Design a protein around this nucleic acid. Structure first.
Ligand SMILES: [Zn+2]
Ligand SMILES: [Zn+2]
Lengths: 148, 83, 93, 85, 99, 109, 99, 82, 108, 94
DNA sequence: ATCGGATGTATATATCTGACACGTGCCTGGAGACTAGGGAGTAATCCCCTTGGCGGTTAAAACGCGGGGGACAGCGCGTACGTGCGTTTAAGCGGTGCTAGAGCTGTCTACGACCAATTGAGCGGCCTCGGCACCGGGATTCTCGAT
DNA sequence: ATCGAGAATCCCGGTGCCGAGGCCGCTCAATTGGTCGTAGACAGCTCTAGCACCGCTTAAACGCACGTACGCGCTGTCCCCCGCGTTTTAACCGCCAAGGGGATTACTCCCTAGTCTCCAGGCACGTGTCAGATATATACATCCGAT
């Protein structure tokens, strides 16, 4: 129906003009379930990090936000062990005019600059605020063994 | 089994009787339409709250107590029907 | 079945106290029941609000007396206050 | 002038406008899309996030939500795709 | 030669008659149908206890009698005896119903 | 008192003190309820009931009847000045209205 | 030769002036003395917070302004522009304040 | 003791309230009627305010008593508490 | 929604869910209070507050001011069809009245 | 020091900085807003309490609040408020 | 000012019928005795804010005058409403049948209260700078007597 | 239909002050984690009354006609509000001073809730009979046209 046309148009845009370092597609037979791949930003301690995540579309779209969840896990204050993401676009200030490219770009940009106001894991955010070098070395240690 | 234009069942003699009970000796000719409009507005206001009360209880019949509660909520208490 | 409580018998006792000969029909008794319930709700709500205002957690007889003074008009309020005070004084001893 | 077909595409459903409504920010979109974004989304403008609660309350109780100046143009100049819609 | 009363005496007679009694002055079936129509406008497939319709009729007749008393006062205020729609409108405004 | 009769009889009332106590306790009015509040409230309720009943019975006797019907309650309430102010916004079913006609509408002498 | 406005054109100017402002229109000390007199009629040797007197003044002025609006409508009903005591009495009676 | 303070509500003070009410012309008997109705209103409010004061076992009438009395009479007032 | 964040932020509100929950529970309303009542009540209160404040700010801007005063609150409330009906027996202190001169009184 | 007194000032200010980021508010206006919030809270809570009492319940759920909002608010303020409350509850639960 | 019809209303008598006042079984709610703990009554202290008084200056109230516009009474026209009669419509009453939904009982499972350790959100107090109030001069705009 | 003088209101620029908005310290109220009793969600069965139909009276509604009395427009008189100038009165502001009573704290005791046992007061159901409604026939108050 309308959501089918919307998702097909989104996929057509994604195929014609893919963004940089993000690649999304339909993982399964149905168009509701998607798989996405994100490369770590160049100016970050996440060098060489490739991350796979799943996209689950609610029945009513785009009037309700999609559910993105990391398959792996990352050491970021806004991501927990299960892979959940704490971003305002995802849940709070979501609007139907937004597209998949915008939310994926925002997720990618989150890695460069963490949000310490409402982190998902307070202890690692406190560690990072205590010292940046420790946070960078710990993130590099995790990402040099689990990202690849 | 819909119902249409039933407000004409509030006939002119009934309005004359109500005015007589109210103490009115002589009545203009355009009073009846104004009274019909006023009565319709009052009925809508009361019945909306009555139906709201009956749906909150997961019922399908508008009992007398819903009407009494709506009337009390609107500032018009009614004695003699319970509560 | 179910049991429904009402103030019918007490109203009849009071009626036979004031007018030993007159009876009372069903609709009038229903009206009296509604009236008693309404006055109970008014006075109880006012007393509860008075208790809340002063940071109390109890309803004593002085909250009820102040609520009676607030609700009822002049002579009615004076007579009701006298009746309640007399009843409490007779009950406590 | 006459608006083009591409310019008359709703940004929510990606189709032609049916019963368009224009917000006080001069943003036009479909009436079903407007009702859905009022009921399930954050009740603002989907594009510039301007709060339109009072405007909606004022105009929908008197059946004045729908744009009429441009609805005639849309229904007149492009009949076939509105018919299949 | 046939006897007929001067215009106004039968009106006063009806005033005295209908202020002495307590019945309901609106026929029950049309009012019941009107109530049912408004209710189906609100919610479909509704049933009405007879007591509900009776209470609604009681309340409506009391309201209309009070409004007509206020209308009569408004009409007499303007040095008249006919109640006119402007009297009803003024009475409703001062009571705050229409504002 | 002797603390051996019923509470209503100990207080000298006809209205129930235990029932009023339960209604105050279960009614969600306050966390605690005193011991003398139900007696006071029952006394006030009984006084008001007796007043209205006396006036209604007087009206019924004046009407040559031995049974108070709602018309007599309406007459008693509306004729009194304190009761009519206490029950100004209340509607009595099958009560009617008091007979009065404005002096302007009466026939010219 | 001295310039005089026709009767009625300075009243409308005052109407426009006082509906555009929000200050209180009664002097504070006489009203405070009146409040204290009534209170000491009720209970002797009382004290007032300043906020209590100010709230009483606010409420009284709002009530009087609303009553004067209703009185003006009552006066206009009888095809007049002058407000009279009977207008106040009718407005109060219809509002239910005196019945 | 105070006496005859109702004459402190002068004629201009009533004309200003009438003007804010939107009154163009005023008769000469309005002022006494306004004074009477204002006195009735003030008595009605102050009686309940003092009752609230006496229940709390205080000797000063606080603004919250006035707010409570006004709310009790259906004249809710915003700006002084509550 | 995920836990480990404030209740006011789980629901996306600004009014306190915990304070409203305590007020409902300690306010002599009912024996028990469900877990979803305070969220609903806080949402309604915040909606009403924002609705009034938007119109008040518009009225303040129409006067070339930058600060809401009670006059602007009165102007916002009395010019709205539903807000005037909701707050109909309420008096706003130092709010004045709306300008309204009857057409009969105007010069002819 | 003085005893602590609670209010709704900071939340009203946070709401104000969303609709109008470049507008302040006076102290008297804030007092009026606090009074308004308290009044509406009391109204809705009392109506919900009576509504739950009529049906011989013991709990004030979101259903009682929803029906109280339906009863109390005018024509479409009620619709929009019910929509907002349902949205908030749904967002909170999941 | 009367007086006659003429009409409507109030009064006295028989009768009969269904609702009111009372009686009986029983069961559910109220009374009696006891224990534990916190709510409120009482005494004391502090310091805020309420009341009282003086002096000045000046904005508002009180008083008077001239006059014009509005309130009020009297007249005449004509139209709309009241009263009465004959006719058409559908309300009211009874009797019957059907089933949808209100009301009650039994299981049981999940939601809400209660309690204890802990910490950050929100409150009280301080401080400062910008928004709004005020003053002074000029431009703009209704108002009215005179054409 | 208009031109112009006198007067009130709005615009604009500069100065100043106080209160609104942000920051800091801290205490206590909300959060989290765990356990337990019971409220209400659900399934099933009973049986009450709400709905639908049919036929017969006959009462209330409707339509039409005549006429009269009340609504409305107009004119005229007069007197009482209004606008403006002058004088008198006391409201308002700033200041200082004393003390009453509001608000907080600590301690104690006694009053109310909660539990268990027991029994009788009040509720539901059933029955007789008399208060009130109705029908019928006079008595009288009241209204309207005619003297
Ligand atoms: Zn669309
Ligand atoms: Zn926009």
């Amino acid at each position: 129906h309308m959501a089918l046309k919307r998702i097909n148009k989104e996929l057509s845009d994604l195929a014609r003009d893919p963004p940089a370092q993000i690649s999304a597609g339909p993982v399964g037979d149905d168009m509701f379930h998607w798989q996405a791949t994100i490369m770590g930003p160049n100016d970050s301690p996440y060098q060489g990090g490739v991350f796979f995540l799943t996209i689950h579309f609610p029945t009513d779209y785009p009037f309700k936000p999609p559910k993105v969840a990391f398959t792996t896990r990352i050491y970021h204050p806004n991501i927990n062990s299960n892979g959940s993401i704490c971003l305002d676009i995802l849940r709070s200030q979501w609007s139907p005019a937004l597209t998949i490219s915008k939310v994926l770009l925002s997720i990618a940009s989150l890695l460069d600059d963490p949000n310490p106001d409402d982190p998902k894991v307070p202890e690692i955010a406190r560690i990072y605020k205590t010292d940046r070098d420790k946070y960078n070395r710990i993130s590099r240690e995790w990402t040099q063994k689990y990202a690849m | 089994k819909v119902l249409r234009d039933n407000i004409q069942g509030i006939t002119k003699p009934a309005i004359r009787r109500l005015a007589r009970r109210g103490g009115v000796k002589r009545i203009s000719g355009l009073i009846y339409e104004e009274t019909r409009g006023v009565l319709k507005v009052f009925l809508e206001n009361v019945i909306r709250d009555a139906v709201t009360y009956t749906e909150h209880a997961k019922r399908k019949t508008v009992t007398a107590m819903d009407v009494v509660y709506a009337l009390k909520r609107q500032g018009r208490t009614l004695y003699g029907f319970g509560g | 079945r179910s049991r429904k409580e009402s103030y019918s018998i007490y109203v009849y006792k009071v009626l036979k106290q004031v007018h030993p000969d007159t009876g009372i029909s069903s609709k009038a008794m229903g009206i009296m029941n509604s009236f008693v319930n309404d006055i109970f709700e008014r006075i109880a709500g006012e007393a509860s609000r008075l208790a809340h205002y002063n940071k109390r957690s109890t309803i004593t007889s002085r909250e009820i007396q102040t609520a009676v003074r607030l609700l009822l008009p002049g002579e009615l309020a004076k007579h009701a206050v006298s009746e309640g005070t007399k009843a409490v004084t007779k009950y406590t001893s | 002038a006459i608006p083009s077909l591409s310019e008359c595409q709703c940004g929510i459903c990606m189709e032609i406008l049916v019963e368009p409504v224009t917000l006080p920010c001069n943003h036009t979109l479909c009436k079903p899309c407007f009702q859905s974004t009022v009921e399930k989304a954050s009740l603002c403008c989907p594009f510039c996030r301007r709060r339109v609660s009072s405007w909606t309350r004022y105009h929908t109780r008197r059946n004045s939500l729908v744009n009429v100046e441009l609805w005639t143009i849309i229904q007149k100049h492009y009949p076939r795709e509105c018919k299949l819609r | 030669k046939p006897h007929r009363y001067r215009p106004g005496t039968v009106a006063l007679r009806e005033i005295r008659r209908y202020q002495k009694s307590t019945e309901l002055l609106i026929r029950k079936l049309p009012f019941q149908r009107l109530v049912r129509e408004i209710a189906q406008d609100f919610k479909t497939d509704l049933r009405f206890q007879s007591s509900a319709v009776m209470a609604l009729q009681e309340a409506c007749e009391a309201y209309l009698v009070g409004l007509f008393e206020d209308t009569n006062l408004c009409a007499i205020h303007a040095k008249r005896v006919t109640i006119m729609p402007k009297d009803i409108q003024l009475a409703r405004r001062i009571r705050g119903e229409r504002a | 008192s002797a603390k051996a009769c019923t509470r209503s009889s100990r207080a000298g009332l006809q209205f129930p003190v235990g029932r009023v106590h339960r209604l105050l306790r279960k009614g969600n009015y306050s966390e605690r309820v005193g011991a003398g509040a139900p007696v006071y409230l029952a006394a006030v309720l009984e006084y008001l009931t007796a007043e209205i009943l006396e006036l209604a019975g007087n009206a019924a006797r004046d009407n040559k009847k031995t049974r108070i019907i709602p018309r007599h309650l309406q007459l008693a309430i509306r004729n009194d000045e304190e009761l009519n102010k206490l029950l100004g916004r209340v509607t009595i079913a099958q009560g009617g209205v008091l007979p009065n006609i404005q002096a302007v509408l009466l026939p010219k002498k």
